[PDB]
Subunit: 423 residues, 2 copies
């Protein structure tokens, strides 16, 4: 089957491009001087944008599809969400977890997402969801490379056998070590928990992704320990701080001091715009803070930052179709990244930057890489974002794994007219 | 042609419903006890939701489709936007305005919007855009009932001949009298401008819609004058305060006092979530306020509030496809109206509440009303909102004026599977 992608636009490049495929890899990328004809074994991008696959750097596949079960959250807070989740966690079964994880994973495949990092709550002696997710990881592997992050949701030091269970999760095969220092009983447990997390990541050679300062508390500064420990161990690339919503509330002087360390450390940041706008600012009356981390500033400083969906129809977020362009849309608005170039470059926040966060080794439209790429029916990132386009084709190992025939809208004026909303 | 809409769901009602049509009107609405068969002259809603048309209570059709012309905004502020617009206004032609207005109007027809209130800048001795828009109003009338609001963008008292031009606009046929008291040189000009606006509305028997306190200034309280004058004249239904973003920044005590007047006055409020999240909070560093008016509180108090798109690809907002479900999505998130019922009832903010704001006399799925209705391929408001569904059919005077064949997404697993993102 497929030998070429033709008539492709590429972000930050002029003109049209031909992507040659061989043995499941990209063999060569060649500029075109005009439109190429279609032929058998050519997939025509039709002057749409070709990008490496969307990435979901932060989702909770063990909580997905449980919104309102057994009860709703309600106050719309992180803290009530954890309480509601704890009630649902007591009701987990193996098949329950696999079915719900797979439901969301199919939406993700449909949405051109080929790389997903799922957190899985390991504050659970039975490790029910983890055992299920390890099977799901193997099952979905033809379509999605799933990383599993062992997430000690109720604390490492603040939950019975929390450290032991976290380590057990790694011994069972979790790819990433998690932590939640702002949810530990004390600041000292918070800091200690990070030492323990880093020690485990080094013992097992695993990545780190900390739920870090997800709280509107200007004194929640666990991020400095995450970055300092990464710098000390020389392991920045392998380390991620998720959320860091407290950073929205820091004074500017501390933030400036901190940013030097953040860039030196080389650690990654995940913002979760759909969830953060909902859960943050809940303790303000009016005015009410936005509560997303300092994405615009990170980008300006060359600090790697990217966007996750976080929860899809779960205890913290009742909405979602696991759509990364939608996540991006919310983040651009709330972060005021609304300049033409900022919007256009927005795709990086859900592609390349997220690949870096996942420490991916085979990602991007480049000769020698696996032929994993998606085609958006749009002229550039700005257009894709504005029109919230579907993924026309998703290609993995040089084979089509998803396609969307786009909607067709007609208005019946003096004559019928097709409406495509371009611009 | 059409005699019936069958298999219809209706918000806040159980089961399925049949809507009988005669002579361009709804003749009767009858409950069904099961699914009805299709037949010729029946439009099958297919257990989707049937609602009266979407409404756009606040857009600027004279500025639409001009983003970046001749220059970009940039700081992303209201104030720079006005400066950029002033540069574009100097370049207006009759045909320019008509073509751009019509481009956005077609997107609106496609999006099931049958009622639109456009502001038109009348701080312009030539009244170029107004004259063009009055023609557009007549031209689009088969598909959209367009209200024209004379908008003294540069002030009534603060712009040469501002009051005369505003009155000239009414004499030429503008439906609604506008004002912009927070942009007047002084608080006293602000208050005086409102007296003059009310006097004109009473002289000409027109509606009022004030760009009111669109500024992060806790001292911008022109809304109390708008409400008090409406109450005094007994004309609440005819009066709207657009934006009121300053209200996001008021102390709670004043707001409580004010709310009594707001409910007694009976005036309408328009929030513009996509634009407000972008333009407000621009003078904060961190934390940064959201800057939308007190929508949740208004709803809790039974104060009529609704959502507009405001600007579509214009000097204040570079994005948009004139999509009301998208506007609604942003507003629910930023306003934290994220409870299941709050999300589900969200449709009211872009249907019934907006009809009230426009003082519409023939609106809603009721016997005797014009057969103006749209069909969403969704089970209820929550589902429509979550999945950002298109308008399957738009019906006006009992005739189909727009339709969307929805996207078709397939994932190629062990077997091909259709993906619809339900839930
Ligand atoms: Fe999370
Ligand atoms: Fe406006």
């Amino acid at each position: 089957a497929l030998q070429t992608i033709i008539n492709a636009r590429l972000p930050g490049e002029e003109g049209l491009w031909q992507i040659h495929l061989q043995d499941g890899k990209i063999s060569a990328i060649d500029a075109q001087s005009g439109v190429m004809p279609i032929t058998e074994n050519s997939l025509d991008a039709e002057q749409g944008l070709v990008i490496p696959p969307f990435v979901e750097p932060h989702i909770h596949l063990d909580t997905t599809q449980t919104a309102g079960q057994p009860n709703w959250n309600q106050s719309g807070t992180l803290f009530e969400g954890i309480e509601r989740w704890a009630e649902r966690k007591a009701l987990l079964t193996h098949d329950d977890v696999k079915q719900r994880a797979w439901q969301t994973l199919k939406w993700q495949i449909a949405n051109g997402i080929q790389h997903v990092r799922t957190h899985v709550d390991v504050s659970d002696a039975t490790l029910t969801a983890l055992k299920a997710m390890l099977e799901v990881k193997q099952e979905v592997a033809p379509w999605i490379d799933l990383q599993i992050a062992a997430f000690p949701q109720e604390g490492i030091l603040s939950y019975p056998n929390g450290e032991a269970l976290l380590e057990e999760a790694l011994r069972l095969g979790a790819d990433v070590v998690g932590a939640i220092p702002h949810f530990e009983f004390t600041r000292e447990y918070g800091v200690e928990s990070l030492h323990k997390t880093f020690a485990l990541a080094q013992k097992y050679d695993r990545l780190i992704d900390v739920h870090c300062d997800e709280i509107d508390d200007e004194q929640s500064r666990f991020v400095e320990t995450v970055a300092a420990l990464a710098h000390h161990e020389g392991m920045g690339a392998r380390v991620t701080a998720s959320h860091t919503t407290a950073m929205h509330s820091y004074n500017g002087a501390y933030t400036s001091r901190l940013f030097r360390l953040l860039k030196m450390s080389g650690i990654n940041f995940v913002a979760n715009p759909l969830v953060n706008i909902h859960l943050q600012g809940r303790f303000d009356t009016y005015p009410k803070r936005r509560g997303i981390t300092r994405v615009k500033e990170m980008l300006e400083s060359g600090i790697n930052v990217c966007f996750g969906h976080d929860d899809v129809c779960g205890p913290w977020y009742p909405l979602g179709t696991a759509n990364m362009l939608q996540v991006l849309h919310m983040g651009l608005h709330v972060c005021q990244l609304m300049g033409y170039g900022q919007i256009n470059d927005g795709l990086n926040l859900i592609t390349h930057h997220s690949a870096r966060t996942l420490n991916l080794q085979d990602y991007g439209i480049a000769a020698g890489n696996s032929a994993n790429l998606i085609i958006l029916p749009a002229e550039n990132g700005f257009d894709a974002l504005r029109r919230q386009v579907p993924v026309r084709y998703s290609v993995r190992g040089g084979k089509v794994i998803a396609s969307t025939q786009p909607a067709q809208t007609t208005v019946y004026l003096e004559q019928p007219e097709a409406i495509d909303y371009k611009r």
